[PDB]
């Protein structure tokens, strides 16, 4: 990875293109909690859907969704899990999610600076509750971090964000937040398509991360 005459890093920009081809997922803050929704694309019938999860847990109070190269995403998630455990052993607990996200982002950043390796073709959304409150972060291939009230990654990122920028309201009831999230995903669909029951997970202050059941998802679909 080297600089162009414009001061650009092409391998990083190309990695971003890989991300754009991944599945669509979004996250949004709501009253005393954070919501994650993944637009799981259903293909074939020979796939064991029961074993396919898009929302990973890093620990009981932190979750993430990824979009981009699947193999790379798996690796970064494992890294985040291990990193989270190291912090708990060292201090006794996790205090600020932001630092976990940074440790991950730094792992990604170095792959854009040192030769012999290619950057991770992965975009992540981190969500959870910590000492400060409910938090929601993005992390791109470059290793750039931003905290959001609401965000999205994947091929539908632009459509979903555009929708959210208009419709998103603060301090919504969990049910309203989920309802909104579903509408946002639907707006990103190709003409003639439909939204399959998405994977939904949420967490509220004082609780552990909660993953919705299949029936619970359908009720909002």
């Amino acid at each position: 990875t080297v600089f162009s005459p414009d001061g650009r890093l092409f391998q990083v920009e190309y990695a971003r293109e890989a991300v754009k081809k991944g599945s669509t997922a979004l996250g949004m803050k709501f009253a005393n909690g954070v919501l994650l929704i993944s637009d799981k694309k259903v293909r074939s019938r020979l796939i064991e859907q029961n074993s396919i999860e898009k929302i990973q847990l890093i620990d009981d109070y932190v979750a993430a969704v990824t979009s981009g190269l699947v193999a790379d995403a798996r690796v970064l998630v494992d890294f985040a899990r291990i990193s989270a455990q190291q912090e708990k052993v060292t201090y006794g607990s996790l205090v600020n999610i932001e630092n976990l996200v940074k440790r991950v982002a730094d792992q990604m950043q170095q792959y854009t600076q040192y030769g012999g390796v290619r950057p991770y073709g992965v975009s992540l959304i981190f969500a959870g509750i910590d000492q400060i409150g409910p938090r929601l972060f993005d992390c791109d291939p470059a290793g750039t971090i931003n905290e959001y009230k609401a965000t999205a990654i994947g091929s539908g990122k632009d459509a979903v964000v555009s929708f959210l920028e208009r419709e998103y309201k603060e301090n919504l009831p969990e049910k309203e937040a989920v309802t909104l999230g579903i509408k946002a995903l639907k707006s990103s669909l190709e003409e003639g398509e439909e939204l399959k029951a998405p994977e939904i997970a949420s967490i509220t202050v004082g609780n552990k991360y909660r993953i919705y059941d299949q029936e619970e998802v359908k009720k909002f679909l």
Binding site: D59, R81, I82, Q85, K88, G92
Partner: protein, 201 residues
């Protein structure tokens, strides 16, 4: 130190004393020896406080990561096996500890683990300087057909006896009960004190 763990038809009951000795006197009357390390798994520690506390932190991290990765709680025997390996690897520069690991999978289990990594399953076990007194009580009164309430009372009597002869033992009794239905439950001191009075202890 006194730690006790027993199995019953469908439950594991573990209890300890709270006294901690440092610099050859009772520096602390209210320490902690009984830990939850998983949803259905608990651990009691004995021996050097420093070493023991470190091991507990490692085990918590190790079991949590296991759960997340495999989407299932680690088998109790596997929990014991980890410790066996962790301790044996440093047997020449060892942790000065004695551990009890108990919990439920498809059945209740209690493992006794020494500092050499030796791990043996049993129906009941105890660790610490007061353990000989506990064994006396359990050996005479323990019954496999006991109820969970009868179990709790026995554990209190066994520790209470140790507290009367072991100068290193003392403090309030901590009791935890593990069942599949409820999971790891720590008993209120209100209930324990009530039982103590009823038992004439």
């Amino acid at each position: 130190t006194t730690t006790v763990g027993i199995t019953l038809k469908d439950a594991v009951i573990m209890a300890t004393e709270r006294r901690v000795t440092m610099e050859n006197f009772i520096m602390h009357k209210n320490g902690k020896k009984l830990f939850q390390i998983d949803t259905y798994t608990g651990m009691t520690i004995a021996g050097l406080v420093g070493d023991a506390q470190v091991l507990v932190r490692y085990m918590k991290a190790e079991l949590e990561l296991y759960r997340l990765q495999r989407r299932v709680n680690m088998p109790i025997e596997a929990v014991a096996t980890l410790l066996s390996n962790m301790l044996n690897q440093v047997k020449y520069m060892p942790y000065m500890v004695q551990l009890l690991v108990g919990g439920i999978d498809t059945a209740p289990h209690v493992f006794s683990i020494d500092a050499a990594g030796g791990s043996v399953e049993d129906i009941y076990a105890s660790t610490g300087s007061g353990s000989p007194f506990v064994y006396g009580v359990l050996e005479s009164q323990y019954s496999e057909k006991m109820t969970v309430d009868e179990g709790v009372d026995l554990v209190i009597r066994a520790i209470s006896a140790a507290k009367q002869r072991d100068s290193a033992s003392g403090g309030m009794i901590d009791v935890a009960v593990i069942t599949r239905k409820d999971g790891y439950v720590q008993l209120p001191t209100d209930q324990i004190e009530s039982r103590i009075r009823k038992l004439g202890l």
